[PDB]
XYZ file of N, CA and C in Angstrom:
756
model
N 0.882 -1.194 0.000
C 0.000 0.000 0.000
C 0.911 1.233 0.000
N 1.353 1.670 -1.184
C 2.380 2.730 -1.261
C 1.864 4.178 -1.158
N 2.800 5.121 -1.074
C 2.446 6.546 -0.876
C 1.548 7.089 -2.008
N 1.889 6.762 -3.259
C 1.120 7.213 -4.425
C -0.350 6.802 -4.360
N -0.578 5.525 -4.041
C -1.916 4.969 -3.862
C -2.655 5.706 -2.744
N -2.005 5.784 -1.585
C -2.540 6.468 -0.412
C -2.950 7.921 -0.698
N -2.048 8.692 -1.315
C -2.316 10.113 -1.587
C -3.483 10.242 -2.565
N -3.531 9.343 -3.550
C -4.672 9.277 -4.454
C -6.000 9.008 -3.725
N -6.025 7.970 -2.875
C -7.248 7.593 -2.153
C -7.783 8.796 -1.347
N -6.891 9.401 -0.565
C -7.282 10.475 0.377
C -7.691 11.762 -0.352
N -7.094 12.000 -1.525
C -7.455 13.165 -2.326
C -8.876 13.043 -2.929
N -9.290 11.814 -3.246
C -10.618 11.503 -3.812
C -11.716 11.319 -2.755
N -11.294 11.079 -1.515
C -12.180 11.103 -0.339
C -13.033 9.847 -0.228
N -12.477 8.709 -0.664
C -13.207 7.437 -0.668
C -12.628 6.496 0.410
N -13.248 6.486 1.617
C -12.625 5.730 2.715
C -12.568 4.185 2.518
N -13.478 3.633 1.712
C -13.496 2.185 1.451
C -12.168 1.741 0.814
N -11.531 2.663 0.092
C -10.256 2.395 -0.590
C -9.022 2.353 0.337
N -9.233 2.663 1.621
C -8.202 2.490 2.671
C -8.122 1.035 3.226
N -9.075 0.185 2.832
C -9.117 -1.207 3.293
C -7.743 -1.853 3.032
N -7.163 -2.486 4.058
C -5.873 -3.166 3.923
C -4.667 -2.333 4.349
N -4.876 -1.024 4.539
C -3.773 -0.133 4.869
C -3.229 -0.459 6.238
N -4.121 -0.596 7.226
C -3.711 -0.883 8.609
C -2.889 -2.160 8.676
N -3.433 -3.214 8.069
C -2.762 -4.528 8.029
C -1.385 -4.396 7.373
N -1.305 -3.672 6.252
C -0.004 -3.398 5.619
C 1.044 -2.760 6.582
N 0.623 -1.698 7.279
C 1.445 -1.003 8.269
C 1.899 -1.969 9.374
N 0.951 -2.746 9.890
C 1.231 -3.634 10.999
C 2.194 -4.779 10.623
N 1.969 -5.433 9.481
C 2.908 -6.483 8.997
C 4.346 -5.987 8.778
N 4.474 -4.738 8.324
C 5.750 -4.183 7.901
C 6.378 -3.173 8.853
N 5.822 -3.083 10.061
C 6.207 -2.085 11.075
C 6.473 -0.691 10.507
N 5.438 -0.157 9.850
C 5.496 1.174 9.250
C 4.440 2.065 9.891
N 4.673 3.372 9.809
C 3.728 4.390 10.271
C 3.522 5.416 9.162
N 2.368 6.099 9.181
C 1.982 7.073 8.144
C 2.821 8.361 8.181
N 3.545 8.553 9.271
C 4.482 9.663 9.464
C 5.900 9.353 8.937
N 6.152 8.090 8.572
C 7.468 7.680 8.027
C 7.801 8.464 6.755
N 9.090 8.657 6.488
C 9.512 9.318 5.244
C 8.963 8.639 3.964
N 8.770 7.325 3.988
C 8.205 6.600 2.829
C 6.781 7.076 2.511
N 6.104 7.626 3.518
C 4.723 8.037 3.326
C 4.526 9.560 3.246
N 5.627 10.304 3.236
C 5.564 11.767 3.144
C 6.241 12.249 1.853
N 5.935 13.476 1.433
C 6.670 14.109 0.346
C 8.015 14.612 0.878
N 9.087 14.053 0.325
C 10.443 14.301 0.809
C 10.785 15.752 1.116
N 10.432 16.654 0.203
C 10.923 18.030 0.268
C 10.289 18.870 1.386
N 9.068 18.513 1.786
C 8.256 19.341 2.711
C 7.768 18.590 3.946
N 7.842 17.263 3.906
C 7.258 16.434 4.950
C 5.726 16.392 4.892
N 5.130 16.768 3.766
C 3.656 16.721 3.633
C 3.112 15.287 3.815
N 2.087 15.139 4.662
C 1.549 13.830 5.003
C 0.237 13.540 4.258
N -0.206 12.283 4.373
C -1.490 11.880 3.814
C -2.662 12.635 4.501
N -2.514 12.911 5.797
C -3.531 13.711 6.516
C -3.624 15.133 5.964
N -2.471 15.783 5.755
C -2.433 17.108 5.133
C -3.084 17.072 3.749
N -2.726 16.052 2.949
C -3.341 15.833 1.654
C -4.882 15.738 1.731
N -5.379 15.015 2.734
C -6.827 14.841 2.930
C -7.510 16.200 3.226
N -6.911 16.984 4.119
C -7.495 18.263 4.536
C -7.399 19.290 3.406
N -6.352 19.147 2.579
C -6.237 19.963 1.388
C -7.368 19.669 0.387
N -7.981 18.495 0.513
C -9.041 18.061 -0.399
C -10.408 17.954 0.259
N -10.683 18.877 1.170
C -12.033 19.000 1.717
C -13.029 19.411 0.631
N -14.237 18.891 0.766
C -15.376 19.223 -0.068
C -16.549 19.522 0.850
N -17.086 20.735 0.764
C -18.118 21.186 1.689
C -17.668 20.981 3.140
N -16.383 21.247 3.377
C -15.793 21.197 4.692
C -15.419 19.830 5.204
N -15.619 18.770 4.382
C -15.377 17.403 4.859
C -14.551 16.547 3.881
N -14.003 15.494 4.420
C -13.321 14.453 3.650
C -13.437 13.196 4.526
N -14.254 12.266 4.019
C -14.585 11.017 4.722
C -13.373 10.116 4.978
N -12.218 10.455 4.397
C -10.986 9.685 4.700
C -10.293 10.138 5.990
N -10.645 11.320 6.487
C -9.932 11.843 7.649
C -10.032 10.991 8.940
N -11.248 10.677 9.388
C -11.416 9.898 10.596
C -10.768 8.500 10.460
N -11.018 7.792 9.333
C -10.325 6.516 9.095
C -8.798 6.660 9.163
N -8.231 7.704 8.547
C -6.787 7.956 8.637
C -6.292 8.088 10.078
N -6.990 8.906 10.873
C -6.710 9.053 12.305
C -6.812 7.722 13.054
N -7.851 6.947 12.731
C -8.099 5.680 13.391
C -6.987 4.671 13.014
N -6.656 4.596 11.724
C -5.562 3.715 11.248
C -4.236 4.119 11.926
N -4.007 5.423 12.096
C -2.766 5.895 12.714
C -2.644 5.438 14.178
N -3.753 5.608 14.905
C -3.891 5.126 16.293
C -3.669 3.617 16.389
N -4.376 2.859 15.547
C -4.309 1.396 15.574
C -2.946 0.834 15.129
N -2.225 1.619 14.321
C -0.902 1.260 13.836
C 0.172 1.299 14.972
N -0.212 1.878 16.112
C 0.637 2.026 17.284
C 1.687 3.119 17.119
N 1.381 4.119 16.296
C 2.355 5.174 15.996
C 2.695 6.007 17.246
N 3.971 5.996 17.685
C 4.372 6.871 18.818
C 4.431 8.378 18.480
N 4.431 8.723 17.196
C 4.441 10.133 16.778
C 3.172 10.407 15.972
N 2.050 10.755 16.665
C 0.734 10.852 16.007
C 0.721 11.702 14.744
N 0.217 11.072 13.691
C -0.009 11.702 12.417
C -0.704 13.073 12.551
N -1.674 13.176 13.460
C -2.466 14.440 13.590
C -1.546 15.667 13.819
N -0.415 15.461 14.516
C 0.518 16.546 14.840
C 1.787 16.668 14.018
N 1.820 15.929 12.902
C 2.927 16.034 11.970
C 3.012 17.469 11.423
N 4.226 17.928 11.207
C 4.405 19.303 10.731
C 5.320 19.327 9.519
N 5.091 20.258 8.590
C 6.020 20.456 7.482
C 7.438 20.804 7.960
N 8.426 20.375 7.177
C 9.819 20.434 7.606
C 10.713 21.387 6.812
N 10.275 21.811 5.629
C 11.076 22.676 4.759
C 11.131 24.101 5.317
N 12.071 24.886 4.789
C 12.275 26.259 5.266
C 11.049 27.177 5.071
N 10.292 26.907 4.009
C 9.164 27.746 3.617
C 7.885 27.462 4.404
N 7.566 26.173 4.576
C 6.339 25.750 5.282
C 6.543 25.268 6.680
N 7.776 25.397 7.200
C 8.126 24.833 8.495
C 6.984 25.029 9.500
N 6.604 23.924 10.154
C 5.650 23.968 11.260
C 4.171 23.855 10.880
N 3.838 24.045 9.598
C 2.443 23.938 9.137
C 1.868 22.516 9.436
N 0.677 22.482 10.023
C 0.024 21.236 10.417
C -1.342 21.077 9.704
N -1.916 19.881 9.819
C -3.254 19.611 9.303
C -4.293 20.615 9.896
N -4.099 20.933 11.177
C -5.000 21.841 11.902
C -4.941 23.203 11.244
N -3.704 23.681 10.945
C -3.586 24.947 10.144
C -4.329 24.879 8.808
N -4.183 23.774 8.084
C -4.828 23.671 6.766
C -6.382 23.741 6.931
N -6.892 23.030 7.943
C -8.361 22.975 8.196
C -8.909 24.387 8.448
N -8.101 25.175 9.131
C -8.469 26.588 9.428
C -8.385 27.423 8.175
N -7.289 27.257 7.426
C -7.185 27.946 6.161
C -8.345 27.607 5.243
N -8.781 26.333 5.235
C -9.903 25.894 4.408
C -11.293 26.374 4.922
N -11.298 27.062 6.080
C -12.540 27.641 6.656
C -13.548 26.520 6.998
N -13.017 25.403 7.522
C -13.863 24.270 7.950
C -13.899 24.061 9.459
N -14.843 24.712 10.143
C -15.042 24.398 11.565
C -15.205 22.849 11.800
N -15.901 22.170 10.879
C -16.173 20.736 11.039
C -14.880 19.915 11.104
N -13.959 20.261 10.234
C -12.648 19.595 10.186
C -11.759 19.951 11.408
N -11.775 21.222 11.790
C -11.155 21.681 13.022
C -11.586 20.851 14.189
N -12.902 20.691 14.351
C -13.426 19.895 15.455
C -12.929 18.447 15.380
N -12.923 17.855 14.197
C -12.538 16.453 14.079
C -11.054 16.244 14.498
N -10.197 17.155 14.001
C -8.759 17.176 14.331
C -8.536 17.387 15.815
N -9.224 18.372 16.404
C -9.095 18.653 17.854
C -9.579 17.486 18.745
N -10.718 16.882 18.386
C -11.265 15.736 19.129
C -10.318 14.523 19.071
N -9.412 14.528 18.086
C -8.503 13.397 17.873
C -7.050 13.769 18.097
N -6.842 14.650 19.075
C -5.539 14.968 19.624
C -4.675 16.027 18.975
N -5.233 16.768 18.016
C -4.490 17.911 17.451
C -4.024 18.877 18.552
N -2.730 19.202 18.506
C -2.099 20.181 19.389
C -2.491 21.565 18.890
N -3.289 22.299 19.674
C -3.794 23.618 19.216
C -2.749 24.788 19.267
N -1.525 24.507 19.725
C -0.472 25.531 19.800
C 0.745 25.295 18.869
N 0.590 24.434 17.865
C 1.687 24.251 16.897
C 1.885 25.535 16.076
N 3.143 25.937 15.899
C 3.482 27.175 15.228
C 3.895 26.924 13.780
N 3.109 27.518 12.880
C 3.437 27.650 11.456
C 4.428 28.811 11.303
N 5.724 28.480 11.265
C 6.780 29.478 11.465
C 7.744 29.624 10.291
N 7.539 28.833 9.238
C 8.404 28.900 8.068
C 8.291 30.264 7.399
N 9.156 30.489 6.413
C 9.288 31.779 5.745
C 7.976 32.296 5.116
N 7.121 31.383 4.640
C 5.846 31.833 4.065
C 4.955 32.543 5.108
N 5.145 32.151 6.364
C 4.319 32.629 7.491
C 4.960 33.719 8.351
N 6.127 34.213 7.944
C 6.834 35.247 8.728
C 6.503 36.654 8.291
N 6.619 37.590 9.231
C 6.550 39.004 8.925
C 7.846 39.370 8.188
N 7.703 40.011 7.030
C 8.818 40.458 6.219
C 8.348 41.725 5.531
N 9.244 42.337 4.755
C 8.886 43.516 3.985
C 7.917 43.175 2.863
N 7.002 44.098 2.588
C 5.998 43.915 1.539
C 4.776 43.132 2.005
N 4.070 42.536 1.045
C 2.853 41.767 1.333
C 3.219 40.430 1.958
N 2.628 40.179 3.127
C 2.906 39.003 3.938
C 1.665 38.133 4.090
N 1.901 36.863 4.417
C 0.911 35.949 5.021
C 1.316 35.703 6.487
N 1.536 36.815 7.214
C 1.811 36.708 8.631
C 0.485 36.796 9.400
N 0.253 35.819 10.281
C -0.984 35.758 11.087
C -0.642 35.347 12.515
N 0.655 35.465 12.890
C 1.048 35.148 14.270
C 1.222 33.668 14.552
N 1.377 32.845 13.510
C 1.847 31.439 13.627
C 1.065 30.274 14.307
N -0.015 30.616 14.991
C -0.681 29.825 16.032
C -2.079 29.658 15.382
N -2.685 28.463 15.544
C -4.017 28.168 15.024
C -5.038 29.238 15.495
N -5.037 29.587 16.781
C -5.939 30.643 17.318
C -5.735 31.979 16.553
N -4.453 32.356 16.413
C -4.095 33.613 15.777
C -4.473 33.586 14.315
N -4.236 32.445 13.657
C -4.707 32.268 12.274
C -6.256 32.430 12.104
N -7.029 31.771 12.970
C -8.504 31.742 12.945
C -8.965 33.224 13.165
N -8.320 33.912 14.117
C -8.642 35.335 14.416
C -8.383 36.255 13.196
N -7.170 36.174 12.616
C -6.784 37.014 11.463
C -7.599 36.777 10.230
N -8.085 35.540 10.056
C -8.909 35.217 8.884
C -10.410 35.422 9.213
N -10.661 36.088 10.357
C -12.032 36.506 10.687
C -13.016 35.323 10.883
N -12.549 34.244 11.518
C -13.388 33.045 11.729
C -13.849 32.922 13.172
N -14.891 33.699 13.481
C -15.391 33.758 14.852
C -15.771 32.355 15.393
N -16.442 31.517 14.590
C -16.869 30.193 15.114
C -15.652 29.278 15.391
N -14.613 29.389 14.554
C -13.345 28.653 14.814
C -12.638 29.162 16.092
N -12.595 30.491 16.249
C -12.034 31.124 17.421
C -12.689 30.618 18.692
N -14.012 30.701 18.755
C -14.688 30.320 19.997
C -14.497 28.827 20.268
N -14.553 28.000 19.230
C -14.312 26.576 19.403
C -12.899 26.312 19.962
N -11.885 26.899 19.340
C -10.515 26.752 19.810
C -10.382 27.160 21.292
N -11.045 28.264 21.671
C -11.009 28.726 23.059
C -11.774 27.852 24.060
N -12.903 27.283 23.626
C -13.921 26.701 24.533
C -13.958 25.172 24.581
N -13.392 24.534 23.558
C -13.496 23.084 23.433
C -12.883 22.378 24.692
N -13.463 21.228 25.109
C -13.004 20.538 26.334
C -11.751 19.678 26.148
N -11.347 19.481 24.902
C -10.235 18.571 24.567
C -8.888 19.246 24.796
N -8.697 20.374 24.110
C -7.481 21.168 24.208
C -7.796 22.631 23.874
N -8.134 23.407 24.918
C -8.430 24.807 24.687
C -7.150 25.589 24.345
N -7.255 26.432 23.334
C -6.188 27.332 23.005
C -6.059 28.513 23.974
N -4.814 28.858 24.267
C -4.524 29.887 25.255
C -4.439 31.273 24.590
N -5.239 32.196 25.095
C -5.152 33.578 24.635
C -3.767 34.226 24.912
N -3.032 33.683 25.888
C -1.704 34.171 26.274
C -0.576 33.615 25.404
N -0.883 32.597 24.589
C 0.182 31.964 23.776
C 0.845 32.982 22.802
N 2.163 32.841 22.619
C 2.890 33.743 21.726
C 3.637 33.003 20.625
N 3.946 33.720 19.544
C 4.679 33.158 18.414
C 6.184 33.492 18.519
N 6.920 33.287 17.427
C 8.387 33.489 17.436
C 8.800 34.955 17.623
N 7.846 35.881 17.436
C 8.078 37.300 17.739
C 7.649 37.706 19.154
N 7.120 36.755 19.921
C 6.463 37.052 21.195
C 5.092 37.705 21.033
N 4.538 37.642 19.809
C 3.198 38.195 19.525
C 2.098 37.261 19.965
N 1.184 37.809 20.773
C -0.121 37.199 20.968
C -1.063 37.453 19.767
N -2.249 36.843 19.816
C -3.277 37.088 18.827
C -3.592 38.598 18.705
N -3.588 39.318 19.856
C -3.825 40.783 19.833
C -2.767 41.510 19.005
N -1.477 41.158 19.199
C -0.395 41.730 18.394
C -0.573 41.366 16.903
N -0.923 40.101 16.643
C -1.149 39.639 15.246
C -2.222 40.488 14.561
N -3.320 40.735 15.288
C -4.409 41.570 14.764
C -3.921 43.003 14.434
N -3.173 43.634 15.352
C -2.519 44.906 15.092
C -1.682 44.851 13.785
N -0.895 43.787 13.648
C -0.040 43.610 12.457
C -0.810 43.564 11.107
N -2.036 43.041 11.121
C -2.877 42.976 9.906
C -3.905 44.095 9.789
N -3.976 44.962 10.792
C -4.847 46.102 10.691
C -4.324 46.957 9.508
N -5.259 47.542 8.788
C -4.952 48.485 7.712
C -6.206 49.330 7.515
N -6.214 50.164 6.476
C -7.272 51.174 6.309
C -8.527 50.757 5.524
N -8.516 49.557 4.929
C -9.741 48.931 4.414
C -10.833 49.073 5.493
N -11.866 49.918 5.236
C -12.923 50.132 6.235
C -13.607 48.817 6.648
N -13.826 47.926 5.674
C -14.325 46.560 5.907
C -13.418 45.790 6.882
N -12.143 45.644 6.491
C -11.136 44.910 7.268
C -10.968 45.516 8.654
N -10.852 46.842 8.714
C -10.593 47.525 9.971
C -11.665 47.203 11.026
N -12.932 47.289 10.614
C -14.087 47.018 11.479
C -14.061 45.586 11.982
N -13.867 44.642 11.052
C -13.772 43.230 11.395
C -12.618 42.911 12.353
N -11.430 43.494 12.101
C -10.246 43.307 12.976
C -10.543 43.832 14.387
N -11.145 45.023 14.459
C -11.436 45.647 15.754
C -12.478 44.818 16.536
N -13.497 44.316 15.838
C -14.555 43.529 16.501
C -13.993 42.181 16.978
N -13.086 41.584 16.183
C -12.371 40.377 16.612
C -11.531 40.640 17.858
N -10.766 41.727 17.817
C -9.947 42.185 18.966
C -10.843 42.257 20.231
N -11.942 42.993 20.122
C -12.905 43.098 21.242
C -13.496 41.759 21.701
N -13.895 40.904 20.744
C -14.492 39.614 21.086
C -13.494 38.737 21.836
N -12.229 38.719 21.390
C -11.171 37.994 22.127
C -10.980 38.447 23.576
N -10.931 39.761 23.756
C -10.847 40.378 25.086
C -12.043 39.984 25.975
N -13.253 39.991 25.398
C -14.464 39.613 26.135
C -14.369 38.135 26.565
N -13.890 37.286 25.652
C -13.675 35.865 25.959
C -12.663 35.705 27.089
N -11.586 36.490 27.031
C -10.512 36.445 28.028
C -10.985 36.873 29.407
N -11.917 37.833 29.443
C -12.559 38.287 30.690
C -13.146 37.121 31.506
N -13.717 36.138 30.807
C -14.195 34.916 31.422
C -13.132 33.801 31.508
N -12.384 33.572 30.425
C -11.483 32.409 30.365
C -10.192 32.567 31.163
N -9.691 33.796 31.232
C -8.483 34.111 32.000
C -8.649 35.498 32.648
N -9.607 35.605 33.593
C -10.043 36.887 34.181
C -8.916 37.724 34.801
N -7.875 37.072 35.311
C -6.823 37.783 36.062
C -5.660 38.207 35.154
N -5.753 37.847 33.878
C -4.671 38.157 32.978
C -5.021 39.435 32.186
N -4.146 40.439 32.255
C -4.262 41.653 31.435
C -3.619 41.427 30.040
N -4.432 40.934 29.103
C -3.935 40.505 27.789
C -3.261 41.658 27.053
N -3.824 42.865 27.230
C -3.276 44.037 26.523
C -1.958 44.541 27.152
N -1.548 43.951 28.279
C -0.281 44.342 28.923
C 0.871 43.403 28.553
N 0.581 42.403 27.715
C 1.638 41.456 27.315
C 2.540 42.109 26.262
N 3.836 42.182 26.557
C 4.820 42.722 25.604
C 5.446 41.615 24.738
N 5.632 41.915 23.460
C 6.323 41.000 22.522
C 7.872 41.060 22.716
N 8.614 40.393 21.827
C 10.076 40.374 21.927
C 10.741 41.746 21.830
N 10.073 42.715 21.196
C 10.574 44.087 21.154
C 10.059 44.966 22.306
N 9.504 44.311 23.331
C 8.952 44.987 24.503
C 7.696 45.815 24.199
N 6.988 45.476 23.119
C 5.795 46.248 22.737
C 4.494 45.547 23.129
N 3.644 46.256 23.862
C 2.237 45.867 24.014
C 1.485 46.071 22.671
N 0.241 45.532 22.535
C -0.522 45.864 21.307
C -0.698 47.383 21.053
N -0.961 48.172 22.113
C -0.996 49.640 21.967
C 0.329 50.198 21.368
N 1.469 49.816 21.939
C 2.728 50.410 21.496
C 3.049 49.930 20.073
N 2.711 48.667 19.799
C 2.880 48.086 18.460
C 2.032 48.866 17.416
N 0.780 49.128 17.757
C -0.129 49.904 16.885
C 0.450 51.279 16.538
N 1.013 51.942 17.542
C 1.663 53.232 17.328
C 2.873 53.082 16.396
N 3.765 52.165 16.765
C 4.967 51.893 15.985
C 4.645 51.585 14.526
N 3.651 50.721 14.297
C 3.290 50.285 12.944
C 2.390 51.294 12.208
N 2.045 52.386 12.886
C 1.224 53.408 12.259
C -0.227 52.992 12.044
N -0.727 52.060 12.864
C -2.112 51.603 12.730
C -3.003 52.507 13.570
N -3.316 53.685 13.027
C -3.964 54.761 13.816
C -5.357 54.382 14.307
N -6.138 53.718 13.453
C -7.485 53.349 13.859
C -7.531 52.376 15.040
N -6.737 51.308 14.985
C -6.722 50.377 16.132
C -6.033 50.991 17.361
N -5.018 51.814 17.137
C -4.372 52.548 18.235
C -5.429 53.354 19.039
N -6.216 54.131 18.319
C -7.284 54.940 18.913
C -8.315 54.031 19.623
N -8.640 52.908 18.977
C -9.586 51.957 19.536
C -9.064 51.405 20.847
N -7.774 51.060 20.867
C -7.187 50.503 22.073
C -7.207 51.498 23.243
N -6.864 52.749 22.962
C -7.024 53.857 23.941
C -8.464 53.955 24.434
N -9.409 53.944 23.498
C -10.818 54.194 23.811
C -11.270 53.087 24.777
N -10.856 51.839 24.490
C -11.123 50.709 25.370
C -10.579 50.884 26.767
N -9.340 51.370 26.843
C -8.659 51.504 28.109
C -9.374 52.531 28.980
N -9.687 53.681 28.388
C -10.348 54.734 29.153
C -11.780 54.395 29.523
N -12.499 53.727 28.624
C -13.891 53.381 28.894
C -13.940 52.307 29.979
N -12.982 51.370 29.935
C -12.869 50.318 30.940
C -12.536 50.861 32.327
N -11.633 51.838 32.401
C -11.262 52.433 33.683
C -12.464 53.195 34.250
N -13.145 53.942 33.381
C -14.315 54.733 33.805
C -15.463 53.834 34.286
N -15.657 52.686 33.625
C -16.675 51.709 34.023
C -16.385 51.097 35.414
N -15.113 50.788 35.678
C -14.667 50.320 36.996
C -14.661 51.412 38.081
N -14.590 52.690 37.687
C -14.464 53.793 38.659
C -15.785 54.516 38.951
């Protein structure tokens, strides 16, 4: 049951065609995370391939793949495999499910042991000069930047592995810093970014009541307010001030 066959089956989404895979793995002491079953250059797995081929948010090969991986006795769970090349380093199936805008797939991955804090940190995902795909590296931060409120709340609230609002990326950026980084003057985008920022804070009020999320400094010692100023994001800067003063006045 070779890699070519496997990648074909999972791309077409026909789980009946996985019959015999488990037995093959078990007879030959192989796992789906082995180099024989990944694309050499990137470490792309059959699970990543499956999530890349969602249709209406689903791929009926996903749960069977997870189940075969578990039954194969794999000590390095397929669900948490990450890309290995310089460009995609750290990208996981969970990241792809979020990129594909599939809450259903997110839930399936999370219920089956997906690590919600894996960092997509390769060059494609870094802050650099010009147009970036920087979203703060973290599944929560990705879901927030791509404006996926239902994914955000699920990541925060799920009983399996809740994502931490305090988690930071390779820059020391929280989701709040990531949002500042993608703020711009698109009136559409700006409103959505600000409402996401507020919704996260409201969630944090309940989920981590004693933590001042807006006081967390990144690797350059910048809070989201100071970052907004530095990056020239005037609208969110003003919003952050307005929040601070309205919050103090409400408490006073």
